RNA sequence: CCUCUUUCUU
């Protein structure tokens, strides 16, 4: 009972690097930390999701006198202990790494091991041979057991061995948004001959045009208009401008065109490129339409785009581009040359991107003072962040488009005559810290509105009176776009089901109900900017996608639920977690801010009055909760300068043990040297959008030819998209998608197989392929997300230098029993790829993670059955750890011992009764000389790597000593070939 | 609605 979930959230990975501090005293120094210091601050708890998926944030935070820097902690857990331990132990690990605590001195009290039986494994004489060769070939260091031999039940004995960006005024024959010399005809005049030009053409235009005329009578009419000419004064004088207004008054789709127009106007035409980042991809592609549009032209023209998968690129002078935060990033790469104005839009998102490349504009207005940087938003502490650019300009639009009316959840009920249904007592009737804003109200309000909002949950959405308000919305009989905010897929696509089986709702004639997720179709997610016929009513449950900066011009109501889905990540032991908190008044003002900007809309807030006095302003960073070896990597690849100094430069500083664990990782898996210093591997894996790790893989694949499968499987494991769809019931996997894996049992073998058959039912017709998807149960939009990630993931690769003769697509056939030579390698690669996820099958879906700690196999894998089925190999290498109720493993992919030891696993023991250990759990049973031979090819394989991705062209060209270790580790990578006179 | 899928990565 729940034991195994304790020491699950227990266990701890790191605490060799954060001087031996862990979950089990963790809490008692910091109790004598606060004892000693006078702190008598107590933790403060949030219960998450519904009452039987109820975990915790704890946080605490801690103000040190000595460094004057107050020193915050936030920690989930599947229950209160569990959160709090995990919290004092992040909060340790700070104070100690600011050397404000000193490292541990003491042991712990007990293991409580209970090994696991060890696992027989033998070579073919011929196969250790080989590898004999190679070591010899190789010059590669062994380790002779026969002289160890002192493992007498004590320690086993291991067998193994400060620049800015660039930038410059605009230039001729200079293309700003490609970084290139255009070097190329007619393109080849005077920059002064192009601003007349652009000058003379927009005079003509402004002149003769009706529709021009039309739109700049309908700009001149924006409330930012107002203010345009202070505005244009305060860009032009102060290098940092500031600009709060309320949603919709003209920011993002005004302030570039004011810009651009008084310098075309001036007669200085080809001096104005202006970058304008937004926050998402939908986002950025639809300004960058509207402004096309009311410039009264084309996109490529003077208007572009830039996101993922999709860039229509301007003229190279006197143009706007519209992209992400990440397109910007990377364009960093290759300096912001000829770029006069960056502005910013929605800074008050705080996610990590953002707040990167406020650091970096911050440095970059610094040393250039010709540069112009602005920053939009509507809901911004603007003293904070003046604050940190040292003091600028706060421009404050006034008044707003058109007025919004916001009501809440007793002003819901109270309109709606709503009453919660019996059986919503009746399922918690059997279970029965009162913080429960829904018992708090005003007198105003009825006695049964009163009793309705006591009866109701606050973490749990109700359908019913989601339903009602939508009935009401109808019966007030107003037209406009309905926009429900749903924090997920789960939640969005079960209120879709339960709306379509409703006959008010389901009718088609009546109302269209669309998805709105990053992770539905491409062109389906711009279903919700195209209008639908008339007597219909558009009805958008979307993800927080739609909270900010686009514009739906027939959005009249928005439903909001006011809650947030974060990406928990609890570092110390590798649990990933998806919670559904409580929103944010930004966030809430923000998702408001989406009605009443073309006519008058309404807000309805599906949350107390109380609850939303009691809910914070602003969501907390990403950069608190994230991990970063990602921006350790950007940092070094645009020499920036230290990861410490450029993290403690940011906005709000992450945590340093946060830092530290990044610096670590980067330093294990080789991205820099000794100096902290970018490697050529670190560059490649830092231009490439996946995980480093999953980069290491890639170049490892293409050393050996299997870079196709190599590219599929990371774009698989780096999405959160699913492969393997489940209906209405579905609690396993289907017969027939259980087949798509064959005899393998590997939801990557699975993943691989039917992207195969999907590319050729897409080769064969788009109406074939849908009908192909949901024949086999998958997921269009997954596939081609897989697709298109793999494809940039391979083209990055050939413009690294990596020959094609290593991407050659191999067909795998999932129904081979038996070995099948590129499809092993590729399932032995991905336990360096998913490195340290490795768990043990014992019965069922029971699972021991590192440690011998429980799990369950995930629902959705083809290794989960309730069956009691064994394996061919107990062993499995899993995506991501999953915490849930319980603990689950998630990605499933079975691999053999060898392949195990070979590449998921990083130490190797000889431990007692000549049985060696490896990551301190795995007991396998073979011969200590061979493991130690097996070991010794590693570090053989590590400087395959490096050479490599030193010579990207000529890795299919090899020396003999490396081939041979590429072959043998081949012929190791087989399934059957530790299954040497073992039945198994 | 008794949770497979917040967002972003020239
Ligand atoms: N795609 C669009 N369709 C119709 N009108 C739009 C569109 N985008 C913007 N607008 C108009 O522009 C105004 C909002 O400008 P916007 O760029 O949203 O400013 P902000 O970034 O400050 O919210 C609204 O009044 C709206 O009428
Ligand atoms: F940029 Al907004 F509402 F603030 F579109
Ligand atoms: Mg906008």
Redesign the pocket.
């Given at each position: 009972e729940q034991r195994d979930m304790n020491e699950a959230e227990a266990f701890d990975v790191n605490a060799a690097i954060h001087g031996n501090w862990t979950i089990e005293n963790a809490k008692e120094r910091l109790n004598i930390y606060k004892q000693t210091n006078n702190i008598r601050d107590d933790y403060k708890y949030t219960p998450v999701?519904?009452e039987?998926?109820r975990s915790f944030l704890a946080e605490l935070s801690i103000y040190v006198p000595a460094l004057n820097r107050t020193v915050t902690a936030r920690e989930s857990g599947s229950n209160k202990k569990s959160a709090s331990k995990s919290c004092a132990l992040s909060l340790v690990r700070q104070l100690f790494h600011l050397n404000v605590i000193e490292p541990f001195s003491g042991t712990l009290k007990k293991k409580k091991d209970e090994q696991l039986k060890p696992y027989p494994v033998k070579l073919s004489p011929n196969l250790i041979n080989k590898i004999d060769e190679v070591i010899k070939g190789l010059d590669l260091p062994v380790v002779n057991p026969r002289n160890i031999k002192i493992e007498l039940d004590g320690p086993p004995i291991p067998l193994i061995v400060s620049s800015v960006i660039p930038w410059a005024p605009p230039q001729a024959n200079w293309n700003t948004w490609?970084?290139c010399n255009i070097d190329e005809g007619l393109a080849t005049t005077s920059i002064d001959d192009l601003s007349m030009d652009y000058e003379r053409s927009l005079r003509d235009r402004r002149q003769n045009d009706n529709e021009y005329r039309q739109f700049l009578e309908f700009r001149e009419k924006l409330p930012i208009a107002a203010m345009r000419s202070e505005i244009l004064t305060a860009i032009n004088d102060n290098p940092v401008v500031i600009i709060r207004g309320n949603t919709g008054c003209g920011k993002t789709t005004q302030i570039a065109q004011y810009i651009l127009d008084d310098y075309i106007c001036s007669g200085q035409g080809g001096y104005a490129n202006i970058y304008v980042t937004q926050?998402?991809?939908?986002s950025?592609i639809s300004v960058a339409e509207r402004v096309a549009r009311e410039r009264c032209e084309q996109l490529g023209d003077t208007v572009g785009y830039?996101?993922?998968?999709e860039?229509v690129f301007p003229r190279p002078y006197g143009a706007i581009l519209f992209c992400?935060?990440?397109?910007l990033?990377?364009?960093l790469?290759?300096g912001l040359r000829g770029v006069s104005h960056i502005i910013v839009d929605e800074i008050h998102e705080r996610?990590v991107?953002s707040d990167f490349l406020l650091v970096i504009l911050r440095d970059m207005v610094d040393t250039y003072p010709d540069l112009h940087v602005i920053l939009m938003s509507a809901t911004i502490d603007t003293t904070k962040f003046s604050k940190y650019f040292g003091i600028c300009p706060v421009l404050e639009v006034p008044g707003r488009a058109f007025p919004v009316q916001q009501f809440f959840l007793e002003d819901i009920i109270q309109m709606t005559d709503f009453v919660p249904s019996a059986?919503?007592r009746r399922k918690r009737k059997e279970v029965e810290a009162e913080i429960n804003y829904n018992k708090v109200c005003e007198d105003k309000y009825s006695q049964k509105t009163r009793n309705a909002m006591a009866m109701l949950s606050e973490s749990?959405?109700?359908?019913?009176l989601l339903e009602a308000l939508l009935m009401h919305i109808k019966s007030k009989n107003i037209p406009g776009a309905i926009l429900v905010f749903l924090?997920?897929?789960?939640?969005?696509?079960?209120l879709m089901?339960?709306l379509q089986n409703t006959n008010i709702f389901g009718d088609t004639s009546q109302y269209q109900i669309l998805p709105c997720?990053?992770?539905i179709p491409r062109d389906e997610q711009r279903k919700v900017f195209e209008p639908v016929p008339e007597g219909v009513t558009k009805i958008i449950l979307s993800?927080?996608?739609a909270e900010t900066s686009i514009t739906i011009d027939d959005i009249v109501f928005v439903i909001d639920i006011c809650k947030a889905?974060?990406?928990l990540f609890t570092s110390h032991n590798n649990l990933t977690?998806?919670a559904t908190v409580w929103a944010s008044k930004t966030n809430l003002e923000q998702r408001k801010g989406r009605a009443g900007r073309v006519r008058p809309g309404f807000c309805f807030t599906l949350c107390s009055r109380a609850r939303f006095q009691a809910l914070e302003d602003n969501l907390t960073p990403?950069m608190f909760r994230?991990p970063l070896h990602?921006m350790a990597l950007t940092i070094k690849l645009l020499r920036l300068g230290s990861i410490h100094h450029f993290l403690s430069k940011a906005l709000e500083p992450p945590p340093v043990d946060a830092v530290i664990e990044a610096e670590v990782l980067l330093r294990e898996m080789r991205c820099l040297d000794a100096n902290d210093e970018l490697t050529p591997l670190g560059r490649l894996l830092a231009?490439l959008?996946?995980e480093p790790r999953l980069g290491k893989m890639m170049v490892l694949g293409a050393v050996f030819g299997c870079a196709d499968l190599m590219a599929i499987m990371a774009s698989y494991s780096?999405?959160?998209?699913?492969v393997?769809?489940?209906d209405?019931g579905?609690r396993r996997l289907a017969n027939h998608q259980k087949a798509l894996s064959g005899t393998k049992c590997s939801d990557h073998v699975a993943m691989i197989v039917a992207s195969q058959m999907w590319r050729r039912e897409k080769q064969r017709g788009e109406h074939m392929e849908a009908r192909f998807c949901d024949w086999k149960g998958l997921?269009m939009s997954?596939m081609n997300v897989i697709w298109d990630?793999k494809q940039?993931l391979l083209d990055l690769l050939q413009q690294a230098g990596f020959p094609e003769e290593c991407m050659i697509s191999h067909e795998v056939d999932e129904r081979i029993d038996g070995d099948d030579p590129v499809l092993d390698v590729s399932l032995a690669l991905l336990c360096l790829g998913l490195y340290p996820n490795i768990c043990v099958h014992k019965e069922k879906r029971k699972v021991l993670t590192t440690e011998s700690k429980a799990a369950l196999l995930?629902?959705?894998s083809v290794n989960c059955s309730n069956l009691a089925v064994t394996f061919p190999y107990p062993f499995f290498v899993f995506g991501e750890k999953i915490r849930?109720?319980a603990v689950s493993c998630?990605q499933l992919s079975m691999v053999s011992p060898l392949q195990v030891i070979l590449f998921g696993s990083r130490k190797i023991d000889l431990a007692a009764n000549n049985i060696v250990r490896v990551d301190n759990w795995l007991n396998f049973d073979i011969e200590p000389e061979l493991a130690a031979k097996i070991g010794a090819l590693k570090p053989a394989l590590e400087d395959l790597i490096t050479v490599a991705c030193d010579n990207p062209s000529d890795i299919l060209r090899l020396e003999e000593p490396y081939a041979q270790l590429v072959k043998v580790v081949k012929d190791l990578c087989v399934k059957s070939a530790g299954d040497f006179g073992l039945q198994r």
């Open positions: 999701g519904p039987h998926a490609h970084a926050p998402r991809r939908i950025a830039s996101v993922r998968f860039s992400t935060v990440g397109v990033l990377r364009k790469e290759a996610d991107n059986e919503s749990d959405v109700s359908f019913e924090p997920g897929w789960n939640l969005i696509f079960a089901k339960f997720h990053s992770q993800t927080n996608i889905r974060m990406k977690s998806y990403e994230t990602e231009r959008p996946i780096s999405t959160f998209s699913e393997f769809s489940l209405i579905q997921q997954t990630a940039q995930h629902k959705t849930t109720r998630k």
